[PDB]
Amino acid sequence: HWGYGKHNGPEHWHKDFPIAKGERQSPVDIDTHTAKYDPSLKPLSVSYDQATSLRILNNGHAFNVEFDDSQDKAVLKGGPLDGTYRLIQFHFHWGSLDGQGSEHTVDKKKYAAELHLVHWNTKYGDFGKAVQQPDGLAVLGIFLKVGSAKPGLQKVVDVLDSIKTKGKSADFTNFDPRGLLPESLDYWTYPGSRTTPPLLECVTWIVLKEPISVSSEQVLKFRKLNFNGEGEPEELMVDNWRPAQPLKNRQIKASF
Ligand SMILES: CC(=O)Nc1nnc(S(N)(=O)=O)s1
Ligand SMILES: [Hg+2]
Ligand SMILES: [Zn+2]
């Protein structure tokens, strides 16, 4: 199936997922001069004080940190959203080099990595149902630049050796996502899709303006993961990003 390789990479996803060449596809380039400052855009409201991280697993495309979304424990509201969205997981997209890795670009500028905190709209009941609606999901995007280490990310980094290959999982309790947020909650928002197959057009994208800095050694640790399953030839988990897609009409609004 699908991957990020020369033979199963993003350029091929359309054959199995036609919606690949759809109308509200993601990621896109954020043209800062074209973005529309919308003064009706309310400030974001991140209520992650009561979060319950459960596990960490390598799905073969990336690593996901799962959360308990059986109650309004970690939710997202305000900004451009209507209703409450519950955190289900977070994952990253990163490159083989420090000059590539993010999915979204800024004025064509590519970052080291990109953090995606995924939330689903509760009025829909379950995540499965949420992916059936135009306003099903809300993804908070955070850019990572290489510089000073991110204390709040070390917990994550130090467990990666336990989930090296595809299918491996590990208990990952008492992780506080708050440690991954920048100081400013200023953002750009637009209507898009999931950036990996089934590529469903259910996402309200929220990309933060201010990047977070992580050290070389932290990002390096990401790059040691394997796409492959245990007992197979090693294929380093690098460049797990999708190229920016055509905006196609859509307007990118700014909260600033
Ligand atoms: C279950 C779930 O949400 N999976 C996702 N996979 N990619 C996502 S992304 N990068 O488009 O936020 S969400
Ligand atoms: Hg949808
Ligand atoms: Zn993602």
From Swiss-Prot:
Consequence recorded when altering residue 59 to A: Reduced activity
Enzyme Commission identifier(s): 4.2.1.1, 4.2.1.69
Record-annotated active site: 61
Cross-referenced CDD domains: alpha_CA_I_II_III_XIII
A Pfam match: Carb_anhydrase
Annotated site location: Involved in the binding of some activators, including histamine and L-histidine: 89
Binding site for substrate: 195-196
Record-level GO cellular component terms: apical part of cell; cytoplasm; cytosol; extracellular exosome; myelin sheath; plasma membrane
InterPro entries assigned: CA_dom, CA_dom_sf, Carbonic_anhydrase_a-class, Carbonic_anhydrase_a-class_CS
Subcellular location: Cytoplasm; Cell membrane
Regulation acting on activity, per entry: Activated by X-ray, histamine, L-adrenaline, L- and D-phenylalanine, L- and D-histidine, L-His-OMe and beta-Ala-His (carnosine).
Note: Target of drugs used in treatments against glaucoma disorder and breast cancer.
Protein name: Carbonic anhydrase 2
Lineage, broadest ranks: Eukaryota, Metazoa, Chordata, Craniata, Vertebrata
